[model samples]
Target: NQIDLNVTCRYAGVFHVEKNGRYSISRTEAADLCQAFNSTLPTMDQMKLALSKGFETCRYGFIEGNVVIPRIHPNAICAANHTGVYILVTSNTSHYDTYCFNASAPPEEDCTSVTDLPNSFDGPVTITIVNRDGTRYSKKGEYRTHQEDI
Candidate 1:
């Protein structure tokens, strides 16, 4: 089945995978799935740590010892009235999404941005008057304003 979402480094290098219609994976299967990704199921503390970092997800997923749905803000659409990790009372055989922890995987780094340098004025020009006495006047379209008297 097509995976709905594949988010990495969402919380302390943790990965979140949501399959089409959400994963209906059993606890054992979920663990295996993490292993397939070269990761492991996150522990409760790990989940909480992610939670403390302001990570929030509306979907329920299997963790180390329980299925939890994390939320940072209460919404009637997702864990209403709850503002923390809400434990879902479901059998291990039941399926949901999955959260995987890959300590070896680092968060993706952003490339440094460089401001573009302005282009130098290189266009047609004309010089009308010039004096060795330090007086000069030039005409170059709008750039003809290049005139100075010293």
Candidate 2:
């Protein structure tokens, strides 16, 4: 799928792309998908480099070593009790997001804002919070604006 608007070059030159939900892209497809973003599938060493540079995600991604799930911090939902780079042994039929790398690729440009809307729009805003002692407080306002005039 072509997602030029949604996908952009990563700050660390490594990207994790998910097409159709979690664990949907296979290794073969990952090779091509990474290219779509002007990148290629990251190698084992490159993945390790990224891991060391603080590249961590909960979702699994395809790399040169088949698959790896990098974790910099512990989370029960992701990687469970594991830490560091953990290899996942799975059949080729299984799929995961594509982990891409492009050393020279620039970050994607931001989309321009619409010129038709007003400078600022007012709307009602409300905030409610519960305290540690089971106490609740709420505040409401009517003329809440999002933009500030320059």
Candidate 3:
């Protein structure tokens, strides 16, 4: 419950499964979805921390790398309340979940934005828009600015 919305740390939550009874998402999709959800993929270090602090998942969750791990204790069962332990599953692979970091969210950009346009006669310009039916329209000839309502 104290999972940070800003750090990419393995979280403690109840993750459901699909119709196939499989709880997983591809490593690639995990990252994008996590970002969209305002989170980031948890790192290996993060997982270890979570494991030590009573974090367990009945299903495998994909983290930062393609590494597949499990939360287990003395036996082969996944439930945080049972016993917090992590298992490094190198042979078996599973879908992963994104531990998104809101801090990693991309900031808005003005890539093609222009500070201002040249409106003087020396820098006169014309804009002609073509309709889908091959019709052409322009307001330059009438010297009308804004084309609509300024």
Candidate 4:
């Protein structure tokens, strides 16, 4: 007798956020920023391309039985007083379970200080995810400009 194996594949696009605290969007400036971060500003087409790649590269398999998957959430905080954009990537398999990426910078005394931020003046951030079967998911989160006093 022979056993057949089946696999499912999917693709997720990249997320992008554009926050303008004081700085305006410019071509030259944007390029410079991308270079600084070792990344390039992604266009709509580029975002789609990334998603396709992610989905095409995913690897999927089945277990003997149902498995309980743990939920994980990754976060980042940025202060308006600070410069540079905070790019968060959630494209890896580990980040697939994350449904939300809370972008807040709380005060040092706050319990969510590590996960939250005090401000969102840095800029826009993007998040992307690729599944095991070559599926990708992405989201863009803009940091808030409001400051939370301690």
lDDT by residue (1-150, candidate 2, tens digit) is 112111322435665656534466655656655554456788777777777766777777788766777788988888765788778765555767768787664333222221111111233433232222334333442211213211
lDDT of 3 by residue, 33-72 (tens): 4443334566666555555555444555556664434454
Poorest stretch of ten by lDDT in candidate 1: 111-120
What's the lDDT for residue 94 in model 1? 72
TM-score per model over all chains: 0.61, 0.60, 0.41, 0.22
| Residue 63, model 1, lDDT | 87
**lDDT score of residue 10 within candidate 2:** 49
RMSD of 2: 15.0
Cα deviation at 7, candidate 3, in Å, is 17
Cα lDDT tens digits for candidate 1, 1-150: 112223433566565655444566666656655664556899888777777776677888888888888888898888656888888874545768888776654343212221111111234533222222334333332111223300
Can you tell me which runs of candidate 4 are displaced by over 4 Å? 1-23, 50-150
Q: Rank the candidates by lDDT, best first.
A: 1, 2, 3, 4
Compose the digit string of candidate 4's lDDT tens values, residues 67-105: 111112222222212222212333233211111111121
Best of the candidates, lDDT: 1
lDDT, candidate 4, at 110: 22
TM-score (C-alpha, index-matched) for candidate 3: 0.41
lDDT values for all models:
0.57, 0.55, 0.37, 0.25
Residue 38 in candidate 2 has what lDDT? 53
Off by over 4 Å in 1: 1-5, 90-93, 106-150
